[PDB]
Amino acid sequence: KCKKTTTCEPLKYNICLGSVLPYALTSTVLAEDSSSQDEVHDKLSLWSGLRNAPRCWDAIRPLLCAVYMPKCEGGKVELPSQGLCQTTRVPCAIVARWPDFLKCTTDYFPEGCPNE
Numbered sequence: 001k002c003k004k005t006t007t008c009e010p011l012k013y014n015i016c017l018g019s020v021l022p023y024a025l026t027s028t029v030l031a032e033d034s035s036s037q038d039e040v041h042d043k044l045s046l047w048s049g050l051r052n053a054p055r056c057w058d059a060i061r062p063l064l065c066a067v068y069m070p071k072c073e074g075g076k077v078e079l080p081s082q083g084l085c086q087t088t089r090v091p092c093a094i095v096a097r098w099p100d101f102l103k104c105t106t107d108y109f110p111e112g113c114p115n116e
């Protein structure tokens, strides 16, 4: 439930929203609005407008990176965790009120995952 089968490809960039990613491979399969790593990069640029809400921005960065530039290894991608979603909901409550995020749905944000 914590991983999804997919084809891994090398990361286009080793930076996500100002963080250095320690892993080398990714997939776009979790980013339902994106059909390539090129599109992912453009969507993340749009998300960066949220930098003007600094408390929400700090919380949401690892969630956006876990969705848009997730770690892929062995033909599997890791999903963003329920715990990460629930924490992000509070500082980003006012902002955006992505219904899956607001509800922290358990198919998209599974419980009991190693990277929580």
Ligand SMILES: [Zn+2]
Residues within 6 Å of the ligand: 012, 037, 038
């Ligand atoms: Zn490219």
Ligand SMILES: [Zn+2]
Residues within 6 Å of the ligand: 058
């Ligand atoms: Zn921080």
Ligand SMILES: [Zn+2]
Residues within 6 Å of the ligand: 081, 082, 083, 111, 112, 113, 116
């Ligand atoms: Zn949990």
Ligand SMILES: [Zn+2]
Residues within 6 Å of the ligand: 100, 105, 107, 108
């Ligand atoms: Zn859903």
Ligand SMILES: [Zn+2]
Residues within 6 Å of the ligand: 111, 112
């Ligand atoms: Zn729990």
